[PDB]
Every structure is written in structure tokens, then in C-alpha cells.
Assembly symmetry: D2
Homo-oligomer: 236 residues x 4
């Protein structure tokens, strides 16, 4: 088989809702042992229940990607009980601090999990960009800045780790049906749909399928890529 | 009396330029995923070879003769396919020319005209079925130097812009249009590997896996995208 | 300076083209502006005279090799070789023909004027993209496609002719104050201005000033570039 | 094209591209404050401006320190007026890019008050010159350029409504101190990748910066203008 993730341990941050949950379920369905994380104990319990309800081995844990202690501790804990995670999905005025903080977190987590991947001479790091919602300028500015940061970062880290058969890729979601987007005013939703050639919102499962492919052996020559998953609507 | 459980079961896929290398590998991968595959070549001997290969690999389908530069040949071949096998709802355009057939403008122009010719012909079938996949394969990183870098960048820029525009035109019909941009694919050698983070050439099968994913139902929200498959070496 | 240099500006009878001819003239070039009709050419000649610019208005069909060859010969006969050339002369499914036609015309003209520039070992070719003309969707598709074609073409031609100290650049206008843009409803106008960080439309003179800089000796190391002049609103 | 009546701050103005920018802005009629990280660099800047007939000054600035930035700005307002034109010219890839963007943000954010008050402004960011390299060099260079483009584009959106434009210039291979001293093999290889078949002069970057600082560039914002003789790197 070419799509089996059987025998692998996958860490998926921000797995309690929406895109993160769908990614955990998809990696599990493909046979991985899945560790989903949230920022709170209640989120982590929920993750564990969801995985069990769907017949997936793994666990839910509490993780703050902004803290070196939390990252180090969580990783240790994972190695203790479950093995090295060789698949890692990072899903966890204002634009500069946001992007800066996000990239520092991506770097923190990525750098921590690389030892394990370097040892195993195999790895998959996949970064999930932020969903498209807010309008006028400030939402477009945040969205374009975050995406640009994500592309550059992903491209650079891919170069640094490539010789070790570790691939680093990103997924850039467009307008996806999630908690934030279900709440959005009718006018926003209509405007947005008008910009989308497929004339509909993406499902969270449609992001998860892309992540699952990238995590497979078939994607082994794909690295430094950002795959946009946005129904044909492009926005820089 | 035997139904495959493979993701493209029940579909008919047309793959142009299927007699060698990347095109052959795509035909085999689509077939392995359960599609009925029609591979094309420009000559009767190429087509006969395609048919034998498919048979040797247990794939249902056929090899046919097709000149993507002629409206007659395209119309005729499509009619023939409907006659005997059904509407092809997956189409992979791989048969691009090169300067071996000043040079950058005529190459890119000719290739885009052929992409448009074929795509436009198959759209009626896809429009009726309210479902489709068109995937365009870019050219392999060919010549080493200057005129080679100009041809390569021009072809890739044309491929991206085209793919993005066609995706907009056909999106409302649940037809996705995507592209794959190969880097250095195997079918002084040390210098090259030094420019590639993965430190190796890509296999033709690694392009075929990406095409196979994009043809699936999981890639349904992915459209207008160019997925680079180049081991981390980027050149514009 | 541009003093004593001969500049050919296609589509110079109205708007952006006229503003470019006047700006190049103000910078001291001898300006040949073109139109597709005799009445347009007379108008060009009157405008230049009214503004104290030496030069002429001529009739030129950029889609015809004869017209191009003839017009060039005429220019050499009476005025000298034009070493500055500005190409300005140009529902969801008209994009392919438009872009194709525009690129063939750019190539035709550029290739014709290169012999003169090659002999002088000096040159400036500047390509003006289209304004966001019609709107909604088909207008965004046409615009993005035209711009992508313009960027790739400009970049490739720049590579081909660089060794001869000829620079090839492009200018990508956003929303400029023109006939099409003056005519849309107040709600349209307000929406549009909301998408533009500068909160206003561009003047044609603001395109001309960029062209004038690129034609100068100061821009001699700038080539293959597309300078966007769009008040901060980006749409690909 | 006149920058008469304006005050321009040009960081890293002691050598090469920075010096050429300070001289070009001065030639266009601006009052120019060039900065260096040391007192000797600042003294040199002042002498060069004087030798070339340019009003202004050289001063000491550390773009990585909020105190230095705040102090230098206050100092400029004290003696010369608010600078409405600002040119930012002043394992390893992540810290470099991060630090550079933090410095761009620090300085840009500080000078914006003055520009916001005047409802007019020009911020221009100069990217790094090509080629001090290995593979780690290509990674640093591409990462820095991507950060510069995204940053420039975002800041332009944030400040546009105030008639402040934010742009960038992306140099290719330019004849400078660092590049003259590069191994001859590097230099030859690089020259082979450039369609114009020559190195850029520092003056050729300065001319672009000068144009972008002018009123004629008022509708240009969020742009990164590459100035690289046709050699593009991805
Ligand atoms: Cl805008 C911004 C703010 C902080 C960090 C990055 C960006 N933008 C951006 N755009 C492309 N690449 C990067 N980058 C790459 C490595 C580190 C930052 N950053
Ligand atoms: Cl003809 C050509 C030559 C060199 C580089 C590009 C092109 N054409 C081109 N380039 C980018 N986009 C497009 N495009 C988009 C829709 C149709 C063509 N066409
Ligand atoms: Ni324990």
C-alpha cells in the first residue's frame, strides 16, 4: 500500500474542533496512532473521546505551542508512552504580532520534533494556514500576511531539513465551513461565495484529505510547497 | 464479476503522451487506482505500446492515436472514446512540445493552445456529468543554463496562469483544474543534487501519485493550484 | 535624459497612452504615438503639438506584420530608430483569446523594434497591462489572466535581450480614473474604494510617471520587472 | 521629482547602497540624515554629505533597540524636523529574518506618528544583496526576500488610508564592498546568471529609491521592485 500510515505516530495540534479534528480523524482512518492537542484539559478529554468514538488509537493532550516547557514536556510524555511522532501537523495594528507569534510557535514545535525525525531519517511536517473570514482590509491584511509568512517559513524549513528525507509542506485553506464561518453575516457569506469559482464553502474533510496525502509515501518528493485549498479563490 | 475498491473505480481517464516516462507512470497509477485508462501517443506504434503496457499491468482501457495540435484529431478521438468506453471525466494533459519541435514564445504558445483545445473539447462531457478533473503536467527541468531557464520559467508561468484561469471558468460545474510542476525527474550529476534539498532525483511514480490524488474525491476543493513536485528546488 | 531619443507609444490617443506620450515628451523624447485609425492619429499629432512635443501620430495595427513593418520603416525614414517602445494597445470565458491576442501583438512589435535596439546596443521596452475594466467575476478572471501573461512574457523577453543592454519591463495598473470606471453606480464606487488602501482611484499621469522612470538611464539595471501601480489593491 | 522641503532618514548610510541612496535623495533636494551603528561611521556620513553639498547629518542608531530609536527620532525632531521619508537599509535563517523584520517594524512604527500627523509619507525597505552564500546562503537570501515582500505588502495596507506608501527594493548582484571581496568563482558564476551580463551599480538602486520617494510614485504601494539585471531567484 501507498496511502497506509500504519505504524506511525502523528501529532496534530489544535485538534479539538473543525479542521484540526478532521485532520486527526483522517490520519487515524489512514491507520496512524494520533495524538491530538488542545490548550485546555477539557479540550484534550474531548479529543480522546472523539478518537475512541471513531475507533482511532492515540490520545488527547494539553499543549501550549507558545511555551518551551510545555513543548518539551509534551514531547517527552509522547515518547514515554507512544513512540516518536514522525508526522506533525501544526494547526494551532495586530498583523505583525500575530504572524510573528505564529512563526515562533511553528519553529519551536518543528525544531523540537526534528530530533526524532532526524533519528528515523524520515518525517512529515505539515503547517495549516488560517481560514479566510473577516472582510474589508484588516481581515485581508491579516490573512495575506499570515499566508505569506507561512509560505516563506515552510519553504525555508524545507531546505534546512530536506537531506534527512523530512518533507515540510503547508496547506492554505480558503473559505471553510467552521465555527467562525457559520456565524458570519449573510452579506459577508454572499460576497465571499461570489469570489469562489466552485460557488461553495470547503468542508473541513477536504482540508484533511490533502493533509493525509502529503503525509503519505506518495508525497515524498513534495517539499517546500504550499497547497492552496480554496475552491479557486486566490487572495494576496 | 469483480469490483475494485480503489478511489477512481467507475471512471474513465484520458492521459495524453502516455507512452514514456511521466505519462506512462500516470496511466499506470490511475489504472492502479481503478480507472479505465485511455493513454495516447502521436503514432500507431506508441499507441500499440501503451495498450500492451496497460495489459501487462492488468489495467482496463486502451491506447489511441492523438494529435493534440489538430481539432479534427481531438474531436475524432473523443467521439471514439464515447462510442466504446464512456465519457472521460478525468483528463491529464501531458503531451507538451519543446524547442526541439526565439524559441520560448512559440513553445509556450503552442502548448497553451493544445491545453485549451483538449480541455475545451472534454468539458461538454464533464459539464453534463456535473463532475470533472483536468490536470496539466508541466515540463521537466530540461536544459541546464540560460535559454533553458528562460524556456522553463516561461512554460511554468504560462501553465500556472492558464490553470488558474480555466479553473475560474469551469468551477461552477464542479470541475477542478490543477497543475503539477515537476522538478528534476529520473528516467556534474553531483552539482545538480547539491541544488536539491532532498539530495535526489524524483521518480516518475512520484509525479503520478500527486496526479492520482488530485483526480480523487478528496481533492474536490483543490482548484486553480499548481503543485510543485521538485524535492524542494525552486526556480522562477 | 530621454533627450533626442525616439519613443514609440502604441494606443496613445486616449487615457493612459496619451498620458505616457505626454510624459515621455515632457522628458524630452521625440514621441511617435499610434492609433488604429486615421482620426486617432490626427488627434495624437494635435495633442502633441498643443503640448509642445516634437514627434507625430501614426496609424498602426499591432495585429498585422505588414502594418508593423511599414510603420517602422516610415519612422526610420523620417525620424530615426525608436529605442523606447511602450506597448499600450490591447462572459467568464473570453480570457484565453484576449490574452493570446495581446501577447502575439507584444511579441510582433517587440521583435520588430529589436533590430534597431540591437544595433544601438541600448533599449527600453515597456508593456502596459490592462486596467480592471469590466467587473464582478469574468472581469476579475480576464484581469488576472492578462496580468499573469504580461508578467511571464515580460520576464522571458527580458532574459532573451538582456545581453544587449535592452531592458524589458511592465506596469500593472489597478483602478485608474477612466471611462469604464467613471460610469459605475455609487455603491460600486464605494465598495471599490474600500478594497484600495489609498482610498482613491489612480490618475493616468501616475502610470505615466512610472513609465517615464523606467525609460530613463536610472532604471538601467531594472529588467524583467512588473511594477504594480494600484494603490495597494492586489488581485491575482 | 523634487524632494525639496523634506527630511529623509536613511539607515546604514555609511557604505555602498546606503551611501548612494543618501546622496541621491540629497541630490533630489532632501535634507538627509544618514545613520550608522558607530560614531566613526556617523562622522564619515557627515563628511560625505558635506563633500557632496548635501544638507543634513550623520548620526548613530541601533535599529535593534527601542531606546536608541526613540532617542534618535527625538533628536531629529529637535534639530531638523520630522523625517517623512524613511529608507530602511540596515539555524541561522529564522533568527536573521525575525530580527530584520523586528527592526523594520520598530523603526517604521516609530516614524509613523510624524507621517500620520503630516498625512504624507514614504517608507522604503532595501533588501539584502545577493550572493554571500553557500546553500545556507540561498536559504537565508530567499527567506529574507520573502519576509521583506510580505512585510512590505502588509504594512502598506495598514497605513495606506493616511497617504503613506510603503515599498521595497530587491537588489540582485550589486558592485559593493562585500561583493568585490567574494571568491572569484562565486563572482563568475553569478555574472553567468545575469541577462545584462554585468553587476549593478549602487547608484542604480538609489535611482529607484529616489523615484519611489517622489510624488510621481504616490499610487505605488505594497510593491517590491526587483533591481537585478534580470536574474530572478526562487
Ligand atoms: Cl509580515 C511578517 C511578520 C513576521 C514574520 C514574517 C512575516 N512575513 C513573512 N513573509 C514571508 N516570510 C516570512 N518569514 C520567513 C521566515 C520567517 C519569516 N515572513
Ligand atoms: Cl506566451 C508566454 C510566454 C512566456 C511566459 C508566459 C506566456 N504566456 C503566459 N504567461 C502567463 N500566463 C498566461 N496566460 C494566462 C492565461 C492564458 C495565458 N500566459
Ligand atoms: Ni505518564
Amino acid at each position: 500500500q501507498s496511502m497506509s500510515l500504519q505504524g506511525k505516530v502523528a501529532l496534530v495540534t489544535g485538534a479539538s474542533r473543525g479542521i484540526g479534528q478532521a485532520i486527526a480523524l483522517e490520519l487515524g482512518r489512514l491507520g496512524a496512532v494520533v495524538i491530538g492537542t488542545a490548550t485546555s484539559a477539557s479540550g484534550a478529554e474531548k479529543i480522546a473521546e472523539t478518537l475512541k468514538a471513531n475507533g482511532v488509537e492515540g490520545a488527547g493532550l494539553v499543549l501550549d505551542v507558545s511555551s518551551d516547557e510545555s513543548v518539551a514536556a509534551t514531547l517527552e510524555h509522547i515518547q514515554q508512552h507512544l513512540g516518536q511522532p514522525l508526522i506533525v501537523v501544526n494547526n494551532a495594528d495586530e498583523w505583525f504580532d500575530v504572524v510573528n507569534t505564529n512563526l515562533n510557535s511553528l519553529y519551536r514545535l518543528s525544531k523540537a520534533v526534528l530530533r526524532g525525525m532526524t533519528k528515523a531519517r524520515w518525517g512529515r511536517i505539515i503547517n495549516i494556514g488560517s481560514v479566510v473570514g473577516a472582510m474589508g482590509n484588516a481581515g485581508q491584511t491579516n490573512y495575506a500576511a499570515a499566508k505569506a509568512g507561512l509560505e516563506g517559513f515552510t519553504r525555508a524549513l524545507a531546505r534546512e531539513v530536506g537531506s534527512r528525507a523530512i518533507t515540510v509542506n503547508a496547506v492554505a485553506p480558503g473559505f471553510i465551513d467552521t465555527d467562525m464561518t457559520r456565524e458570519l453575516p449573510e452579506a459577508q457569506r454572499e460576497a465571499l461565495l461570489g469570489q469562489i469559482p466552485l460557488g461553495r464553502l470547503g468542508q473541513a474533510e477536504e482540508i484533511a484529505k490533502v493533509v493525509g496525502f502529503l503525509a503519505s509515501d506518495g508525497a515524498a518528493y513534495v517539499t517546500g510547497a504550499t497547497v492552496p485549498v480554496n475552491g479557486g479563490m486566490y487572495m494576496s
